[model samples]
Target: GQTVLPFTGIDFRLSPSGVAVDSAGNVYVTSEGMYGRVVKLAGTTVLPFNGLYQPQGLAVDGAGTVYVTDFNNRVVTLAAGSNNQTVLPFDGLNYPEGLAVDTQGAVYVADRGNNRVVKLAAGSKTQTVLPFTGLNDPDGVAVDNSGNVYVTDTDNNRVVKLEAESNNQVVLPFTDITAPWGIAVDEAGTVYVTEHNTNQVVKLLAGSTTSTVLPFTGLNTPLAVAVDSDRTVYVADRGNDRVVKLTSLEHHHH
Candidate 1:
């Protein structure tokens, strides 16, 4: 979507890090704050925290419950009707920054400050999935159709993959990533990542040895990426304080 300005209006300023969309098209974006907020967009209306705290990552479940990784306060959930609930507290999360939901309702959180990935089973308080560590400043996360989790190691500047069956971790070994942060997966299992310091989006095909660099040309410090149902890529341009939408998915194919 292109920027639309009105003659007598102003814009909201936020340090948004993650974004997600529901089946009905409600857009959810996370912001950074002592008590963070998840900004929701329904049609022309932009709605602020319905509940959150230092929210850095987001994911919408099949039922439309919005899951937010509150970096400072921990994990929280907003049900379909906008009912907010504190699903998990800070003790279980050390600066959580990325969230991803599986088909079976499991939620994966990238605890950046803790340098690990954690999973919570559906409707359970049990930490069914534990840390897939050995990463430095892991920031973003996503799960493929087959339940493989991909995490971006920011300080190490690379992506890592973890299979669901074990806590074992494997570095994707991409040499071109420059401060890798946010991550998203397409329907076909291709992974899209935001390079914060590079101001670009990089693509990694499943089982590929290397990744393609898509210049998010014109963006100022693009931090996170999400793909909508139409496959359009959306980026959180942090330095510019704007969200950029790319109408094509072709960039990832090449």
Candidate 2:
């Protein structure tokens, strides 16, 4: 039973790891089955972007170009359209898990197997692995308004943030998190992290060392997280095989 939005059927079989939305509200989901692939959902239609390998995370840039972490491919980039011209097929990327893009067009990938975040500059293949030493099984990533990168380190059971120009190192290391899986940042710079093991959503405000928003309880294995323009939090609850929308309680009361 969902509170805000209706419960839509399972978008696909097995794990639906990464999800992205286009300008038209169309949804794209990545299934890491035997052979990984991306599927587009519009109304009742589903189109597949097949030929991928363990596609785990996804992010759509300002120009609507989708960047994916090909876990088995050891790289991340816009694998389709004209945007493919700028490839991020960096070397030494072992089992990349999550991805996020900043305002400056820089792409950040959570190289989980390598335990590092790889930053790729626009129009360049050169990679700068950030927070190289702090990460432990980073699964999902999101970039905030200030160009800060937030990552969910599952094995470490924490969420970490790296400032924009500080050698891309951890500005905030939160060890309070338990099994952090997916992450997203709101326009107000509020960071939201989903704890799969705890089945909760925690919000970290700007400049806060601790969470400002109370732990959102009553979820089942929330995996991937995304916030829309209207501040609606969309969570991919893997255990339930459903997508849940977390609407603001204030809005609900009003």
Q: lDDT per residue, candidate 2, 1-254, as tens digits?
A: 24423324444464567666665655666667667655555543333444577777887776767777775555444443542323465778777777888888788887777787788887775888775456778888888877777888788787777776784556454537788888888888888778877787777777776674334556788777877776667766666655666666454565
Model 1 bad stretches (over 4 Å): 1-11, 44-51, 129-131, 165-168, 173-175, 249-254
Q: For every model in order, what is the number of clashing pairs?
A: 2, 0
Per-residue accuracy of model 1 over 126-181 as CA lDDT, tens digit each: 77545566688888989988888899989988788887677467888565788988
Best of the candidates, TM-score: 1
Off by over 4 Å in 2: 1-14, 44-48, 75-87, 165-175, 212-218, 249-253
C-alpha TM-score for every candidate? 0.86, 0.82
